[PDB]
From a paper:
As the virus buds from the cell, the viral protease cleaves Gag into several fragments, including the capsid protein (CA) that then assembles into the mature capsid shell (core), rendering the virus particle infectious. The CA portion of all retroviral Gag proteins folds into two separate domains, the N-terminal domain (CANTD) and C-terminal domain (CACTD). In mature lattices, CANTD interactions form only intra-hexamer and intra-pentamer interfaces, while CACTD interactions are also involved in formation of inter-hexamer and inter-pentamer interfaces. Our results show that, like lentiviruses, RSV is sensitive to IP6 in vitro and in cells, where in the mature CA lattice IP6 binds in a pore formed in the center of the CANTD hexamer.
To further understand how RSV CA is able to generate both regular tubular and pleomorphic polyhedral CLPs, and in particular how the different inter- and intra-hexameric CA interfaces allow for the observed flexibility, we also performed subtomogram averaging on polyhedral CLPs. Most important, we determined the structure of the mature CA pentamer in these polyhedrons to define the interactions between hexameric and pentameric RSV CA assembly states. Pentamers, on the other hand, organize rigid vertices, where the lattice is curved in different directions. The observation that within pleomorphic polyhedrons the CA pentamer constitutes the rigid building block prompted us to investigate if the pentamers within T = 1 icosahedrons and polyhedrons are structurally identical. We compared the model of T = 1 pentamers with the model of the pentamer derived from the polyhedrons. In fact, the two models are virtually superimposable, showing an RMSD of their C-alpha atoms of 0.74 Å. This finding further underscores the observations that the RSV CA pentamer (1) is very rigid due to the tighter packing of the CA domains in the pentamer, (2) always promotes the same local geometry, and (3) is independent in arrangement of the size and shape of the CLP. In contrast to the pliability of the RSV CA hexamer, the CA pentamer represents a rigid building block that acts as the local organization center that defines hexamer shape and, depending on the position on the lattice, overall core architecture.
Author numbering:
A (entry chain B), B (entry chain C), C (entry chain A), D (entry chain D), E (entry chain E): 11 to 148, 152 to 229
The structure:
């Protein structure tokens, strides 16, 4: 077992501290530090360091739930890369959470007894749990373009709130367009209304408005 | 396929966050991270991370348009480094945008089937699209030297606004000179007017004014 | 003897300066720089640099006390990895604190005469002393959720103050739950009260409240 | 040809942005990045990135003037390390500024045709031009010690303004001394006046005043 | 001769700029960059870059004085590692300050003619001069604990001012104790007075007060 660098962990913790849990740069950094299959000890200490107390509790809950789903799929298929062929290799949650015999508190023994399939399953479970908690911790129909706000800031805020919401993926573009048309105070409303071409994409609307906007 | 370092990507994202999209240092950094030919997956994720939502939409649009121009030039010349000699090697936009069969979401297969000419064409297209969006996202005839502003700040602001505008390249120096002469409040106006030598370059005017300026 | 990098020491000192003595990231960084067995000279200079004057005095006291406990255990067992089999290898506190003959002020001679068991015992003692001083230097029953404060901030503050207190480890979760129920101003109080399910964990309570909270 | 690292260039640009053009640390950093003989392309892009628009215009002017002086010295001596023995190796300004045939815009061809003497001459010329522009871009007889200002701040400000001025090098110390004596509000004036020893150096005056100053 | 990295020098200069000249971290960093024996050119340029103008003048003075003491000890002992056995190897101050023949302005020739004993003597002299100037550039009996100030801040400030003063080393602990007892506003005064145990060390007093302090 080789531990992760505390320098990388400190940089990731400061990234989470400044950018937040949900920024795409933060998720990219987590994916980076989630590259090699980690032992339960590694992921547990990593989340202990980078996350606050309450997000850490939420993450422990979510990780347990995802690992339980994994173990249900494992008992539903004896060909799991964590399982074996005989019944003596069936993987219990004590072995996944690092609670089994010969593993509690000892990362060396952990790395000894664990399977690579076990490691990758634990890692994917932890990543999904992190995503859930990030989506949970920190309203698009209440967003208006302020009287003094520029249009690119309004578009950024609106696209952020619409994509980070509970809508299906196939309903984001029409909603963003129809919110550009009805929000975005009446000067830009009339600018979009009197478009000789038909704008059928948020990017095209943004380009058109940026071209023909009233410089002020 | 080898991914780009998330450390470099984080540094580039913070550079774009503090300096903006159009600064020459930002374009130099992008050229740096645009050195090796990138796969559509790499450039797409890079622009997803460094750009906000609305600039990312604009960039997707511009990248598509530039790739379409490339494919028109490719059907206009069967000797494209992305094309082949026979008709079976003609490159479709699904293969350029990474949408073709065996490539959607898989960077390894992407790197397998793609040509080096394909990669360099995609990369140049993405760079040109980034330039377009940067020029589009964030008035030189309205610039005056404030009563309390120094002259080097006024010259910096004016040269910035004139070079980052829609003028032809051969019309920037005369405009900068004639704006130095008519803006730049009447003390410096008279200082430039009573120049025993003829100043025929913005640098020479700046040097002269910095020499003979009223220390205050 | 090889000294620790002043770059790492400067980074650790700034970490202690911004995050404090008790943050889990700071303790992780200290554990990182406490990886190889250090000589008394190294640990002494390290604590001189990273700690202020008063915490350094406290740490000297605590380190002495812990080393005295170690020496009592050593005279209680002749099989200490710092001791030897005969009486001529018994380790005095002058040899542990670096005060013995041939060691005062000289790290090379120190590294010469010291045992690896001596080094690891000194290191563990210094780590425990650092923990004591950190817990000592900088009230959970006085924590209320402010009228304008969000719930995740209140939960973070409360869990921090409860886990960094004098309670036994087996009494933190019930106290955190019962403080969520009685603090956390009456809207969230009624939200937790009318829970159709029984919430038996701080993480579950946090998840439930974050789901059903009044968006405002 | 190998390009300079954009990381070093970004760090140097931020150094120039925070410290300014004239700080000794900035000149040291420029000397550092001016260590290996650079091609006209390298120096031109470097100054384009680190300098603003108006300082870049000034620097282009100054670089041209210094290169013209170099070419005059070259036509005044056929043994220039840039020249050759016959008349066919005489170096024109198009070859120095990178404007000659086979060099315009191409750094590889540039590195091919250029001589090492050419490179070092271009580099020294660019360094001298940078020094000129830095001295030009951003009054010692108007400096007074404020009623609330400390003496080391006043001495720093005065020595800075005197050494960064148009005085000869052999006239700075007497001026600094006589400005310490006549500025530096009458308490320190009388403290310097009643000096039982004769102080004949700014450092000695500073030491004496720091010793006998009125602690307040 | 190999120059020191301008990156390390820039980091050290910023350390001196933020932390000051007298902080233990700054002295540790200087000791770090003072590890290999430096040539007079190196130390001179280093102090030119990291120190301001007035501290640099003070440091030149102090370095000269310390080198003169070294040369007096050298003429008092013909076995100096800088000296030789015959009279022709006697080391003059022109050779120490780098002013001798073949050394003025040339670091290569400097490194050629200088002895390793010369280098280490110059280096130790420069370090002692830096210590003197740092102690000189930027009152413990005037320190009171403010009505709103915490006790650890007061203890830090007091220990700093007492240890960075003109007292002998054997008089700091009693003074710190008696200042804890008479300063440190009457609540803590009575808390220390009514100590059932006798506190005979600043660390013990700090620990006792931190234990029994009035939480508020």
């Amino acid at each position: 077992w080789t531990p992760l660098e505390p320098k990388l962990i400190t940089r990731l913790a400061d990234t989470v501290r400044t950018k937040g849990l949900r920024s795409p740069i933060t998720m990219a950094e987590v994916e980076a530090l989630m590259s090699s299959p980690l032992l339960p000890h590694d992921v547990t200490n990593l989340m202990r360091v980078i996350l606050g107390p309450a997000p850490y509790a939420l993450w422990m809950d979510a990780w347990g739930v995802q690992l339980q789903t994994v173990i249900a799929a494992a008992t539903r298929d004896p060909r799991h890369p964590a399982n074996g062929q005989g019944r003596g290799e069936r993987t219990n949650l004590n072995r996944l959470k690092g609670l089994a015999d010969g593993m509690v508190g000892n990362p060396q023994g952990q790395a000894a007894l664990l399977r690579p399939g076990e490691l990758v399953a634990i890692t994917a479970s932890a990543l999904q749990a992190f995503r859930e908690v990030a989506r949970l911790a920190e309203p698009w129909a209440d967003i208006m373009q302020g009287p003094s706000e520029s249009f690119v800031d309004f578009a950024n805020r609106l696209i952020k709130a619409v994509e980070g919401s509970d809508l299906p993926p196939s309903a984001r573009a029409p909603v963003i367009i129809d919110c550009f048309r009805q929000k975005s105070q009446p000067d830009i409303q009339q600018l979009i209304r009197t478009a000789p071409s038909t704008l059928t994409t948020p990017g095209e609307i943004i380009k058109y408005v940026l071209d023909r906007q009233k410089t002020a």
